[PDB]
């Protein structure tokens, strides 16, 4: 099922269809360990203190003022980010029923090749003006 | 059909009609259809400055080849800087100060001394320099504030370390210092390599620009063949740079009174424009369409719709010459009874 409806005006840069599954599996394998971050609040308190990694944002969240500052603190610290279509599916991948709008992934040895492949994929995305 | 009518007379149909009765005269002329003797004396040139000469010398050349008396420019450009320059011929030097303080634009090149990550870092460093900023003369040691409305990144060349930036700024700001500050911000370093003004005030570089080979060719052609079809395409009337102001149409008997120095009065007003506020600079035009003076408004566009007499504006600067219309003040329904007394 691929319906690209009800997207935020700031949805770009949206992820590709296959990058969705790759990020899903990476987030799963990161949830199997304690190297994962959930919730906007934890995202601010743990991005400010360094902890370079990957941040995945939901593409169908309204209002947009709940998390709009993340895509600027990223460039203030040169961190990558990417948007994904749904938040219910993102929460299901994160391991709960209640959905979430932001997920932050940290590196680890078990999924290191997949994490590096996703990290190089993210930085190769086109840049909207 | 009224949108095709000329400048400072375009869309006059969409004005507030106060009265429709006046006595038309035969004196005065349209701005574009003036005699070539005075079409040049009241005009401006939208130049394209070359690199080698200074700014207070290009206008000297323009004066000495046009055979006029006084000239002034919009913004002083240092040598090796090109782009839009607005030169005014003596009866147009009245409007110089409204031109020397306007919204300039620029395109330049900055030479980064050491290698950086890429163009995104420099664009971010540009974005972090927008709004009121401190400045200092490139060469009296004083610190002042200037504003930069916008910025952008055109291209980056990693091999030569060359970056092109577009800047929308104000009058008095120094790009030769903005580049030093931008170099200090990235930590590597910087200098200003290239500079060119793209927009000065209202006259852009998209339309109506001529090089100084056009100005010489027109003068030669006129002086020899007695043909002025080419000067009419190089010089433009004053009204071209007053098209954004608020208009005020009058009648023939008031024009010479205003030119002598009488404050605008509601009995003389013929049409007025929607959107006039107190202490707002407006333009007072003749029925032909012609810049009589620069007027500071004194009655909101709604007060005018109610009252029947009194001061409507005071003049900041008057443009036309003393005797262009005959003296027609002192004879009307009023102001003649007082003479009988």
């Amino acid at each position: 099922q691929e319906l690209l409806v009800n997207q935020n005006p700031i949805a770009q840069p949206l992820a590709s269809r296959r990058l969705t599954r790759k990020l899903y599996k990476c987030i799963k394998k990161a949830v199997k360990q304690k190297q994962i971050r959930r919730g906007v609040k934890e995202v601010q308190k743990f991005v400010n203190k360094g902890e370079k990694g990957i941040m995945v944002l939901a593409g169908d969240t309204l209002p947009i003022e709940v998390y709009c500052h993340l895509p600027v603190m990223c460039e203030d610290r040169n961190l990558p980010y990417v948007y994904i279509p749904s938040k219910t599916d993102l929460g299901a991948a994160a391991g709960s029923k209640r959905p979430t709008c932001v997920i932050m992934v940290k590196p680890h040895e078990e999924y290191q090749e997949a994490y590096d492949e996703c990290l190089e994929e993210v930085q190769s995305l086109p840049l909207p003006l | 059909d009224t949108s095709q009518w000329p400048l400072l007379l375009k869309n006059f149909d969409k004005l507030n009609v106060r009265t429709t009765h006046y006595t038309p005269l035969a004196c005065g002329s349209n701005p574009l259809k003036r005699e070539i003797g005075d079409y040049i004396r009241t005009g401006f040139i939208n130049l394209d400055k070359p690199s080698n000469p200074s700014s207070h010398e290009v206008v000297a050349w323009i004066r000495r080849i046009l055979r006029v008396e006084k000239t002034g420019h919009s913004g002083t450009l240092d040598p090796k800087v090109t782009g839009c320059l607005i030169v005014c011929i003596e009866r147009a030097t009245r409007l110089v100060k409204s031109q020397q303080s306007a919204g300039k634009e620029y395109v330049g090149i900055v030479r980064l001394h050491n290698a950086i990550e890429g163009g995104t870092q420099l664009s971010r460093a540009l974005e972090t320099l927008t709004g009121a900023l401190f400045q200092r003369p490139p060469l009296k040691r004083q610190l002042r504030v200037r504003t930069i409305y916008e910025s952008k990144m055109i291209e980056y060349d990693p091999e030569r370390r060359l970056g092109i930036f577009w800047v929308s700024c104000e009058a008095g700001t120094y790009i030769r210092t903005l580049c030093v500050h931008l170099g200090l911000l990235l930590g590597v370093g910087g200098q200003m390599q290239e500079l060119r003004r793209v927009r000065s005030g209202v006259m852009s570089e998209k339309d109506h620009m001529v090089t100084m080979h056009d100005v010489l060719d027109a003068q030669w052609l006129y002086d020899n063949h007695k043909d002025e079809s080419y000067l009419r395409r190089v010089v433009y009337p004053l009204e071209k740079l007053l098209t954004s102001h608020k208009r005020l149409v009058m009648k023939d008997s008031a024009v010479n009174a205003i030119c002598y120095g009488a404050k605008i009065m509601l009995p003389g007003v013929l049409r007025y424009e929607d959107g006039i506020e107190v202490n707002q600079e407006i333009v007072v035009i003749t029925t032909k369409g012609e810049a009589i003076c620069m007027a500071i408004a004194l009655m909101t566009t709604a007060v005018i719709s109610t009252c029947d007499h009194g001061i409507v504006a005071k003049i900041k600067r008057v443009i036309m010459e003393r005797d262009t219309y005959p003296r027609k003040w002192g004879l009307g329904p009023k102001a003649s009874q007082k003479k009988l007394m």
Binding site: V5, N6, P9, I10, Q12, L62, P63, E65, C68, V72 | -
Partner: protein, 64 residues
């Protein structure tokens, strides 16, 4: 919170308790976002809103 809405063609809120517009679009939350008095991310919001041109300045002026 349980209050959901979806705009119709006239451009006014239509409050509902479900989650999907009968035409098949998700519904927004009728309540605004929570606010912290000591907020510092005005620049970060302004920059993106300008960049995607969804800022309230860029919108047409209201009728008066």
């Amino acid at each position: 919170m349980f209050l959901q809405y979806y705009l119709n063609e006239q451009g006014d809120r239509v409050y509902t308790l479900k989650k999907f517009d009968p035409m098949g679009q998700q519904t927004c939350s009728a309540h605004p976002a929570r606010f912290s008095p000591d907020d510092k991310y005005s620049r970060h919001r302004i920059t993106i809103k300008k960049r995607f041109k969804v800022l309230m300045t860029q919108q047409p002026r209201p009728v008066l």
